[PDB]
Design a protein around this ligand. Structure first.
Ligand SMILES: Nc1ncnc2c1ncn2[C@@H]1O[C@H](COP(=O)(O)OP(=O)(O)O)[C@@H](O)[C@H]1O
Ligand SMILES: Nc1ncnc2c1ncn2[C@@H]1O[C@H](COP(=O)(O)OP(=O)(O)O)[C@@H](O)[C@H]1O
Ligand SMILES: Nc1ncnc2c1ncn2[C@@H]1O[C@H](COP(=O)(O)OP(=O)(O)O)[C@@H](O)[C@H]1O
Ligand SMILES: Nc1ncnc2c1ncn2[C@@H]1O[C@H](COP(=O)(O)OP(=O)(O)O)[C@@H](O)[C@H]1O
Ligand SMILES: Nc1ncnc2c1ncn2[C@@H]1O[C@H](COP(=O)(O)OP(=O)(O)O)[C@@H](O)[C@H]1O
Ligand SMILES: Nc1ncnc2c1ncn2[C@@H]1O[C@H](COP(=O)(O)OP(=O)(O)O)[C@@H](O)[C@H]1O
Ligand SMILES: Nc1ncnc2c1ncn2[C@@H]1O[C@H](COP(=O)(O)OP(=O)(O)O)[C@@H](O)[C@H]1O
Ligand SMILES: Nc1ncnc2c1ncn2[C@@H]1O[C@H](COP(=O)(O)OP(=O)(O)O)[C@@H](O)[C@H]1O
Lengths: 139, 135, 135, 139, 139, 135, 135, 139
């Protein structure tokens, strides 16, 4: 109960919502855009329309009660940092954030983010790893 | 054995740097010299080249590699043309980063052996990373 | 015998109108209803459809046509994906308007039987039209 | 001698220059951009860098001495109409102009253009014709 | 009856409508924008909302029946030239047009405009004249 | 007798050229050298100067003119400041081109003896020009 | 005694809120209703009005105030016209926020008793605030 | 010696540099733009051209040795927050920052800024105070 919450349902965020659901996990999916919230209705325990930067909507959401909260806001560094800021204020156990660039990463580190994700770069490392496995582990 | 990465953006450059760290040799290539220089220290050989040019593909020796990764980004046309050419050279394993849905669809019909979607794929990784929290 | 034009822009719509004037039957198709209506009076059948969707391609019956013209413009990805699909249906003659050089290059390797370049092609027409001045 | 002149060396204009050259015809190729003029050096009797809207450069060019002058200016209705305007003033026997749209066509008709070309539409008719030939002429 | 018609009710056009009305003249005021048409309701015999570039609306307007028609379209060279083009087709006795610049002037001359107005420059001459009068006519 | 035009745009330059044609002497001034040169042949003296600078106004000798025309355009602030300064120098006749309604309103309270509105004013001219058709 | 603030931006609204906190009565005014509402709870009376309109200035009763602050921002013309009008009403103290140098220059010649430059002025405050560190 | 440093020489920053100088205080003035640095040459002990967001240039500057450092970067929230971030890393005793808006303020609070300045609002309070003084203190 109330273990995972994902804010920002783009390619990255919506993808963790789907995988979680597939794995049988309950998940809180949120976005400011309603068309996005309706797109993940069949995958989330609860899919709410909310502005993550709004300190009150965060309360109506009950976000203070989640062990992990993922901020997957995309090309909006401000909404992303602001949200992570409020989350850190609600003392959320684990806040993971998708970073847009170096600058964003630098502020997130000090803003409270426990883990920063750089999709492009990070996948680059995992692809390198798969390549190595193909030969090293020989297969 | 052989590894070749075409397109040294955040995705492509990252795989070159990782392969290097993991003690692997890698051919790094990009049409932009500035990109090639940024990864020269990580690749066995870093070469400036337009991957859509067959002649540049041959002077490159790309046909001799076991795995070639197409990491072209925004230039979707170059990406699909490049993988079309690599397919003609019968490269054993051609992996391509997909820009979008239509792109993925052409790539699968074009001969891409593996199609990568950084955002989506990383998303699944994070979900699985999230579960392991109680493993 | 059968003629099918996908993409009713200036180029595509024009060919539909001409075929009609020349007493030929033609299937007109476009993803945009507004475009489909604009040529409804010129085609035997004008249908709204996304040419990249295999199911819409089948409910359309496109596989039964002798000549299919892909006149998608700016959406280069839809254009190449659409011709890739038509090729799977073994359409006898698939003619495609090329947006640019890379586009032409993928199209030729993809199975386009004829590649049209309005600007260039019309340019040759005008030159030949210019000479005839003294013929 | 001095039969054809092409102003505007884009896909359309450069293409008539090439075809003319292939057919053994002498041609005057002009453009305001030097990189364009250098690209058609091996196809034109003479390739000059000039602003077709400049009334003087038109004289230095000797354009008044050509039977046919093609205005192949692209996405610049103003430069296109202006040029055709000056050409009509020099009393050029035949002025052909590539039109961008309906509006452009309407002004060109009254401005002096003897023939208006709409590449996209016009090629559409010729493609229809080729299709008909495939079946009608049976081949 | 049906002597003057003004198309384009901006500062320039609306001003001739007002002056005409003050002088006791009947005037046809037209504009595509309704807020403009409503602003000159108390000054024009008839104030209609119409697109001057639309060949049909020009007929519904009855513009073919006016001795003078003023095209006072502003920063829209295309709508301005297009309108003057249609007007010249309806064989209007006198078509006066406000020109935006040199290019516009050049096309209007050939498009049919009987008189071209350049507010800024033209007023400049009249101001020079007033200055001269102050001293020469001594007053 | 003395005439001075500040701001050589279409409006201001035009009055300088007309005064010249009418055999009158005129001081032409503008902050932009390019504008000053364009009218150098029409003015007795064409000087580059920022009309808002009192010192440049004095080295100019503007205070000795009977009529000074402020034809600054878009820079409404410079326009009103310039006329404020000319008023301090008690110039007998200061005529100013108004950019808009608020501008006209400040100018009248500031000391502008005549406020010109090219668009509106020309509009009245045309209406009167229209009537004379049957005079 | 009487205080009137025209223009409820960050600067103007702030002074209204402070005066309120300090137990002072204040007339808040702005052409934008949304701005007027935002400060309705802080002013004795918050009124929507265009400060450039003499009639709205009279129905407002502005002429009865000892201090009137013009805090119009970007609309420099409204700002100078408004202070020009207040000067006609002989308001004892008219303080105006200056947008820039030319603005300050017109304002001083127009009758502004005090000209405020938030950025500059606050800058001096901080410097003096910095020194006091060792006082 | 090395007491005050001001980064960003706009209206706000340049103004504290001037006042400090007038009061006989030594001050370090810095900006990325050279024309700005040259404008405050006669007011600062030292006026250097540097990118405050560059971690190295901050070292060449010797900023680690100042009791107070003012970040007066204007309409560039990113450069402003980034700089304050590096400054907080160098453990500067007092970092004051000009905030552009609420969002900026919120990040600065957590980023390390010891004092946040909102020129417009803050001056508003001081103006209110001057008004009160006029009457209350009666003068
Ligand atoms: N303040 C916010 N609160 C909640 N969700 C937001 C907020 N701002 C943006 N979002 C959502 O986060 C997502 C942005 O991630 P993004 O990568 O841009 O989507 P995509 O990958 O499809 O382009 C969008 O679905 C957007 O609606
Ligand atoms: N035809 C081509 N041949 C070789 N490299 C190319 C070609 N087209 C694009 N590239 C390279 O592929 C890379 C794509 O990464 P990209 O996503 O566009 O930049 P980024 O990852 O920083 O956002 C670029 O560095 C680009 O120079
Ligand atoms: N996937 C698709 N399936 C069917 N039609 C499409 C598809 N994508 C684009 N089109 C249509 O192809 C036409 C291309 O003509 P276009 O050049 O883009 O407009 P225009 O010729 O006026 O400049 C458009 O009318 C567009 O709606
Ligand atoms: N005033 C001018 N005089 C001469 N040439 C011009 C003028 N204006 C534009 N051109 C040229 O006409 C051509 C425009 O045709 P265009 O279709 O835009 O080129 P492309 O097909 O490659 O996009 C360009 O080569 C341009 O430099
Ligand atoms: N096609 C058109 N048909 C009729 N009126 C038009 C057309 N296009 C523009 N107008 C009108 O002509 C006027 C433009 O003159 P303008 O100078 O731009 O107004 P203003 O002086 O207030 O800026 C506007 O009132 C506009 O609505
Ligand atoms: N402070 C000033 N002192 C002197 N001249 C000025 C000042 N400010 C602007 N000007 C000049 O006044 C002229 C105004 O004419 P303008 O309307 O702005 O250009 P245009 O008439 O071509 O549209 C410009 O040439 C400008 O350089
Ligand atoms: N003519 C006017 N009469 C009364 N109030 C006005 C007038 N013009 C502008 N204002 C008001 O003055 C205020 C100026 O503050 P401003 O700086 O423009 O916004 P902000 O302080 O948020 O940046 C605005 O709220 C505006 O509505
Ligand atoms: N990264 C940076 N490092 C140092 N100085 C900077 C940096 N970014 C901006 N600045 C400077 O800070 C100042 C911005 O303050 P600003 O308010 O915009 O100036 P102004 O008040 O004249 O508009 C400018 O002088 C700018 O050059």
């Amino acid at each position: 109960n109330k273990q995972f919450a994902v804010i920002g349902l783009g390619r990255f965020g919506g993808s963790i919502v789907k995988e979680l659901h597939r794995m049988g996990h309950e998940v809180l999916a949120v976005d400011i855009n309603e068309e996005k919230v309706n797109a993940y209705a069949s995958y989330a325990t609860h899919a709410v329309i909310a502005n993550a930067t709004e300190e009150n909507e965060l309360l109506s959401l009950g976000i203070r009660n989640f062990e992990y909260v993922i901020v997957a806001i995309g090309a909006n560094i401000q909404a992303s940092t602001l949200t992570t800021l409020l989350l850190k204020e609600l003392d959320i156990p684990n806040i993971w954030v998708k970073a847009q660039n170096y600058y964003h990463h630098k502020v997130l580190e000090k803003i409270g983010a426990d883990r920063i994700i750089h999709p492009e770069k990070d996948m680059g490392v995992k692809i390198a790893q798969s390549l190595s496995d193909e030969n090293v582990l020989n297969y």
